[model samples]
Target: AKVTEAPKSEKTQDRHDYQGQHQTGIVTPRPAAGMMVAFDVLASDREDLERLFRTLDERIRFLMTGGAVAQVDPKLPPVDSGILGPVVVPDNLTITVSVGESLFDERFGLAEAKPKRLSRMVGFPNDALEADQCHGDLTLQFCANTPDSNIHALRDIVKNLPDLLFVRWKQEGTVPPQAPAKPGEPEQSARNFLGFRDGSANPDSNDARLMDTRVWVQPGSDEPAWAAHGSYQAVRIIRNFVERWDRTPLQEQENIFGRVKTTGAPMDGRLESDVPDYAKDPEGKITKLDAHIRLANPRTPESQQNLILRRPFNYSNGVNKNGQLDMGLLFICYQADLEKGFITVQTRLNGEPLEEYLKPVGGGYFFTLPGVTGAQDFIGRSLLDATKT
Candidate 1:
């Protein structure tokens, strides 16, 4: 969302109303690869906190095509498109011990066979990036929540960035668009969208290796020279559909989840491969009549809309205002188009059975400028000069 001290005319509001009618909101489901950061700046340091927020906040805008929109201006006009990715960062993270790390690992298997640790909340968005292997057996996440992503998570993640000491890790490429940004990915950067053979089984490719210009890298992106290869990420706070699913019969649960939990097959008769052969399995003996994935998207063998990139993480925030199991997803994702991406899936799932299973109480949208090789390009050298004052 943008800020405008300027008032609008009645005509503008009327026209704005019309755009919303055609607008379809998007949602990056829970259990997502979301990260919550805690800034070194204490809670008492409110002015600095907001100043930091405004720095990144002022630069990004939601385009409205799909995915999360960066809030640069409210008066920029409502858009049907948005940009995704987490870049333009200033540093790396070095994990320190004693902040409930052991408990997190023990409870959620943060260091288990699969090693799933979707826990805790910091106080900043710029600091933490969700670390997960949601797309694949082996992956490290660097994501946060979007407007359709998460609210409380972003607040925590951003608040924590300045305090942590980022040390080291294996150099896996940058995060790519969860869905196909290009056609037939790993093809060429030929403007077709990052095509990664998103067959009928899995929507986007499994925990994909984040890439350079291939993912959501924009033309002349505003990142610094050094951060040409980095990205900004959003992680949604997601909740599991298991309980709600459990209440339903095996048949209905299968329909809502979209894939066979037991065999992991396509509902409409497709192979386990990313791409499915739906025609061969028409009635969906392979897939249920009303599977979860099916409801999420149309059964198109080559449709990007069906490819919702989900990186879910579990969180135990203690008690909600009502004192229930306050656990949910650290959901986050990336895409080029809002309507074509999350919006498409979310609109179709207006009254999802899964909704009853989970409630999205909080989350906000954010923009990620590509990591810069240098910080000057993002903040500007003139800004540095201003610091002397």
Candidate 2:
């Protein structure tokens, strides 16, 4: 009898190509599991920095593509982690690398090339930021179909570049899958810890023209040349006061979010996709003037420039010191201009009604590097090249 190898399972076949003009995880659809890991850079000079980027490119490419693990001498440690079995599966893994403002310090002679608006995330009016959990020289965002894939990828990179990168702070979260939408209706956005549909009015990422104008850094813009095609990333780990929110009246909750609890429709509208007629209710009759959705996006002609592409995940961090549930949103967003996008929008949300139930504890602003063009190129190649000039 002839022996034949079993066909590969369809579950292991999902993947997103690594090479592109921009990073994968940003615009990619939200996966079930996601992680944000910030790291301190240990590279001393240009050569060390180059090695770090190159090694990351090689490892990310391999891990995302999935391949057979090589067997070494029984005495030595294994090449792969062996966590995902003998053969690795892609599981649509995306590792998006970005650099914080500190990375451009004089240590690496990068201070001059820092993106125009890049800066440390200062405490907002409502933020109770914890220093230890706030910032890092580099931040890597991992998204995959499973939490295991995210952990495996992070472990693989840590193992490979132990000397060059050190973990600073890490947070993992997930998007609970929802049932499919009915025919002729737009799919519902993922619900946050508040149970309100987050990202209900997000700008369409599929529109190339809109993305170019609002998301990607253009060549001739005020930003540095190497920063072209890159994006400014704003991450926030907000702690939700769930117990208090849960006890609040449902009508109040709906008014606070400016949407129906059951269908995510605006207070004056019937469907989730229906646009809130802010024009008709300028005086805040239907939707409260300070409602989160209203302040986040006022639907004014000038507000278009402040639009951000949000990709958030729900996080539950056990319990806080006070014995209350510590769960909230791992809010991530991207934009072409940092000041014009997240900062402006967040400023408008200052002291809003939602602030009563949410406290932002930790997060940072980072500049996502441009993507690798091909096998010969590596992440941050443009920035490294700019250093020579």
Candidate 3:
């Protein structure tokens, strides 16, 4: 992404390191926009699959480093799409690549290499999984302050990789911009479409020890070596009943979430940092037993492992047939293990009251690739290497 010209905006000057022990996008402060695109692999064999990944590795390296895509013949389709004109900057761009259970199907002889817990995301009883928009062989997440830059990078890279991967589904999202925090005030959590802060319960990303306990897959774990530092990701496209929700009383809305609408504090709690004492309200007088927060994480010692890191975005795709706005949350979460993290909490949420106001439409399960450690280190290279007897 070599720039013929520096970005006009000073914010674009800020950049995150692309090569690291872990990918930058997860913990890095979100840029203005992002796109998640899934692809179905058409590779005939392991060799074809490796070639596809290697090409992606080289192409992504150039894009993330700000190197201009080299142009070929003037008459033929350009090497770069030329969408951004002649100049391009990273704009804190980050791309996360992941593999789905479908990638290990019989076509590639990779079923034995699949992560132990990795499987096609099963539809819950309440889910209405849309076939066209759900599962895929792989996924790419492009995030940056410049929306066009995100698109341009993907377009340029995908142009070079034709038959191996075909675009299956795509969705775009943006974080609501926030102002600087006041002195002594901690940064506010990002809000979902529901207007409630979404990630207040996330574990500390800066604490590597805590992250090892909660987020990163451990080296000695029973899982494959390729997943040593990687994590499992779950994406859910939820359709909110906004019109029905809006008509509800204010107090009822607060009661459902078990948090104040304005401050995001628990019922009977004063500040956002205040933890709800579920034991004190054992009778469901304050924080009800069926409250979103109560079922999501009971805050007890045993339930600590059930905590998850939530990265969600609000999405709107206009009105449907009934004139209702088709808008809701694109729910994303990362966890070290499926059983301890999402499954435990999601099972508890089976009969939560909020289910009546929202429907789970689509999305799938994916296992993220380990970080690129060096120039020669392509993601899943170890998995490929391990496969070679």
The estimated TM-scores of all candidates read 0.42, 0.95, 0.94
Please report the TM-score between candidate 1 and the true structure.
0.42
Ranking by lDDT: 2, 3, 1
Task: Find the candidate with the highest TM-score and give its number.
Answer: 2
Kindly list the per-residue Cα lDDT of model 2 for residues 1-389, writing each as its tens digit: 34685445455668998999999998888788999999999999889998999999999999989998866577878888887877889998999999999999978888988998899999999999999999899999999988888999998999999999999999999988888779887567888888888887788888998999999999999899999999999999999999999999999998888999888899888877787989899899899999988998999999989999999999999886888998999999999999999999999999999898999999999999998888788999999999884
Per-model CA lDDT versus the true structure:
0.33, 0.91, 0.81
* TM-score of candidate 2 to 2 decimals: 0.95
Name model 1 segments beyond 4 Å from true: 1-34, 37-215, 220-235, 240-244, 268-275, 280-290, 297-302, 305-308, 319-324, 374-389
What value does the lDDT take at residue 118 in candidate 2? 90
Tens-digit lDDT string for candidate 1 (82-158): 22233122112111101122222333222321101222323232222334311111112323322222232233233
**Candidate 1, residue 262: how far the Cα is off, in Å:** 3.2
lDDT of 3 by residue, 31-97 (tens): 7777788899899877898898898887777677675545656777677777666545677788888
Candidate 3: segments with Cα more than 4 A from true spot: 1-8, 70-73, 183-185
Q: When superposed on Cα atoms, how far off is each prediction in RMSD? A: 20.9, 3.6, 3.3
For candidate 1, give the lDDT. 0.33
Q: Candidate 2 — which residues are off by over 4 angstroms?
A: 1-10, 182-186
